[PDB]
């Protein structure tokens, strides 16, 4: 019992942390494209607005 | 007949000794198989853990 435990909680932690840490890194990755198409639409518009 | 019943009653009483030895050295096969599984799991415990 202690032996299915401690295999089945690896398991699905391992599966668990690398969806968690995929997220992150997309977490990170989507507001550093936010900054770039944030300042891509203010130059684009503030152009198209002269 | 006098002896064939007693031929036959040394032997079967062989016989039911026999029978008490397998059993017990059976008994004590399945203990040891049992406990040498009970330290194959722990064992194993690690095994999963680095798993």
Same mark, same amino acid.
Do not use: F, P, Y
């Given at each position: !019992? /202690?032996? /299915? ?6 398991? &699905? ?6 969806? !968690?840490?995929? &997220? ?9 494209? !936010?900054?770039?198409? !944030?300042?891509?639409? &203010?130059?684009?518009?503030? &152009?198209?607005?002269? | +007949?006098?002896? %064939? ?11 039911? %000794?026999?029978?008490? +030895? $397998? ?6 096969? $399945?203990? *040891?198989?049992?406990?040498? *599984?009970?330290?194959? %799991?722990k064992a194993r415990? $690690?095994? +999963?853990? +680095? %798993?």
């Open positions: !019992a /202690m032996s /299915m435990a401690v295999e089945s909680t690896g398991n &699905a932690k391992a599966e668990a942390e690398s969806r !968690a840490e995929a &997220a992150r890194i997309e977490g990170e990755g989507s507001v550093l494209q !936010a900054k770039l198409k !944030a300042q891509a639409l &203010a130059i684009e518009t503030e &152009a198209e607005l002269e | +007949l006098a002896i %064939e019943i007693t031929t036959n009653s040394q032997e079967a009483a062989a016989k039911h %000794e026999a029978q008490r +030895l $397998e059993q017990e050295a059976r008994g004590r096969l $399945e203990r *040891q198989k049992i406990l040498d *599984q009970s330290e194959a %799991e415990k $690690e095994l +999963l853990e +680095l %798993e």
